[PDB]
């Protein structure tokens, strides 16, 4: 099997890739919901306490607790970028002031954002794979269409044409020669 095989695999693969893409979109939406919910809870606390969280957070930045470690990994010929988060324990957390009871709400939001960011590091690692995978699907479906909707018809013509040339030659011999 060749075309009949390719055709089947091509299609099986395009469904698998449609699902992946859908699940990545689903993940992307949840990211949005998760992050805004967290943001809304900081607003709540900021409003309630009068403190400006965004100010305090941003002005206390110095050195990164949350870093990554970046690798290039050869996988069946294609080079992929992978990331692993690493968390420096030498660096302390933020100690936000003037929140009182609201401090625990912020603590929990921080817990959430950290886990969300880790999730982004994993999506980022997923990126090169999906990009390659995208182009493979596109190319593969280009070939299958060429064969089906171009190369075959074009060959059906060529062979029809060739037979007409030979019919005319046969005809011209019946007459010009004998």
């Amino acid at each position: 099997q060749g075309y009949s095989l390719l055709k089947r695999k091509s299609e099986a693969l395009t469904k698998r890739f449609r699902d992946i893409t859908k699940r990545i979109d689903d993940a992307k939406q949840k990211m949005g919901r998760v992050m805004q919910t967290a943001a809304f809870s900081l607003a709540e606390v900021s409003y309630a306490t009068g403190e400006n969280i965004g100010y305090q957070v941003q002005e206390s930045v110095s050195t990164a607790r949350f870093k990554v470690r970046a690798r290039q990994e050869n996988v069946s010929g294609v080079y992929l970028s992978q990331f692993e988060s690493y968390i420096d324990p030498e660096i302390n957390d933020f100690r936000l002031t003037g929140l009182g009871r609201g401090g625990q709400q912020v603590q929990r939001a921080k817990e959430i954002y950290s886990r969300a960011v880790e999730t982004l590091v994993e999506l980022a690692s997923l990126q090169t794979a999906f990009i390659i995978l995208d182009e493979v699907i596109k190319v593969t479906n280009r070939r299958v269409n060429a064969i089906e909707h171009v190369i075959i018809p074009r060959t059906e013509n060529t062979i029809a044409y060739i037979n007409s040339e030979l019919d005319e030659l046969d005809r011209e011999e019946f007459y010009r020669l004998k």
Binding site: G32, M35, Q72
Partner: protein, 118 residues
């Protein structure tokens, strides 16, 4: 290239930036006094100023591993973003609190492409 790249850089609005900074990704390079995040404001931040920061995190700095950017902001400079193709930094377009979800108009594949900087 790879072993030097350990930071996550951000180009994003007030709320998004605050959340990420809480997770602990922010850093000030002590020698250069540079930050690895740039807060954006609609109305005030110019397209030219975004392009500077994008270029800066992407090509001028050797230590950024992943660049997070609000999709809306990246849409302002889509030309520049699409043209960037290097393996590092990995570029991730994400939502804001003002724009949690994607337009229902957009296909899944388009949404996912934009996510990965296309």
């Amino acid at each position: 290239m790879a072993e030097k790249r350990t930071l996550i850089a951000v180009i994003a609005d007030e709320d998004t930036t605050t959340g990420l900074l809480l997770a602990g990704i922010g850093q000030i390079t002590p020698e250069t006094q540079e930050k690895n995040f740039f807060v954006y404001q609609e109305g005030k931040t110019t397209k030219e100023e975004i392009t500077d920061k994008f270029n800066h995190f992407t090509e001028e700095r050797d230590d950024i591993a992943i660049l997070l950017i609000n999709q809306h902001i990246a849409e302002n400079i889509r030309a520049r973003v699409d043209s960037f193709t290097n393996a590092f930094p990995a570029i991730l377009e994400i939502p804001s609190k003002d724009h949690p979800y994607d337009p229902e108009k957009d296909s899944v594949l388009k949404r996912v492409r934009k996510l990965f900087g296309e």
